[PDB]
Amino acid sequence: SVPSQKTYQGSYGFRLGFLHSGTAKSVTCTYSPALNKLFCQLAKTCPVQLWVDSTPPPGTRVRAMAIYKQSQHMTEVVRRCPHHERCSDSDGLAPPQHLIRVEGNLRAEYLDDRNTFRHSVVVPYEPPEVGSDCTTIHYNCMCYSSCMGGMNRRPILTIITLEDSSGNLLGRDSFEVRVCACPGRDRRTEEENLRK
Ligand SMILES: [Zn+2]
């Protein structure tokens, strides 16, 4: 009833990577290593890199799930707010309720867990292309952190799990997400407070 968030490289040495986008007022998506926190604008492309030390077997998949970071909310399904689930912005594949979409991948599957009712989205793992050392998935987050009735100003975590063809755990990583109007300013502000 609470998905595990424990970091776990496993046998293939799985871990995430993030681009270095800066904190300019105009940035649509930026990542803070010091806070392990991704700041992005509503429904904007969020590149997430997948890094491994060895290639996992064919049929390996990559799943993304969000949970609330505070323990008192951890048991509540993270979902889109009463407004955004009704704004008819589906891409055909993502259910309107799902906060996290994968962008530009026809093989993305969206899951509604029969037991926990949590949402997740899963894609096949593709090894890196020639001339690349990693694989990138593009994610969208489809509500603001502050959406009333939805995330409701609460911070979330996005958990990325490397899975075999049966859904058994091969690797896990995680990062905090804030969806806000101005990712650059918010990352600067929070990183200033962290030193102080
Ligand atoms: Zn919303």
Author numbering: 96 to 291
Paper quotes:
The tumor suppressor p53 is inactivated by mutation in about half of all cancer cases. Most p53 cancer mutations are missense mutations clustering in the DNA-binding domain (DBD). Due to its low intrinsic stability, the human p53 DBD is very susceptible to inactivation by destabilizing mutations, resulting in unfolding, followed by rapid aggregation at body temperature. Here, we have systematically analyzed the structural and stability effects of all oncogenic Tyr-to-Cys mutations (Y126C, Y163C, Y205C, Y220C, Y234C, and Y236C) in the p53 DNA-binding domain (DBD).
The crystal structures of the Y234C and Y236C mutants revealed that both mutations induce a substantial loss of hydrophobic interactions, resulting in the formation/expansion of internal cavities in the hydrophobic core of the DBD, without affecting its overall architecture, and, as such, these mutants represent classical ts mutants. The cavity created by the Y236C mutation was significantly larger compared with that induced by the Y234C mutation, which provides a rationale for the much more severe loss in thermal stability upon the Y236C mutation. In contrast, the Y236C mutation creates a much larger internal cavity without the collapse of neighboring side chains into the pocket. Interestingly, the sulfur atom of the mutated residue, Cys236, is located almost within the van der Waals distance of the sulfur atoms of Cys135 and Cys141 (distance of 4.1 and 4.7 Å, respectively). The latter two cysteines, together with the adjacent Cys124, have been associated with conformational instability/plasticity of the human p53 DBD and form a cryptic binding site for arsenic and antimony. The drastically different stability loss induced by the Y234C and Y236C mutation (ΔTm of 8 vs 17 °C) is particularly interesting, given that the two mutations affect the same region of the hydrophobic core. Here, ATO had a much more stabilizing effect on Y236C (maximal stabilization by 4.1 ± 1.0 °C) than on Y234C (maximal stabilization by 2.2 ± 0.5 °C). The Y236C mutation is located closer to the ATO site than Y234C, but it also has to be taken into consideration that the Y236C mutant is much more severely destabilized overall by the point mutation. A more recent study on ATO rescue from the same group classified Y126C as partially rescuable and Y236C as not rescuable, in perfect agreement with our stability data showing that the stabilization of the Y236C mutant by ATO is small compared with the overall stability loss upon mutation. However, due to the much higher stability loss in the Y236C mutant, reactivation may be more challenging for this particular mutant, requiring a much higher gain in stability through the action of chemical chaperones than for the Y234C mutant or other mutants for which a ts phenotype and partial reactivation have been shown in cells.
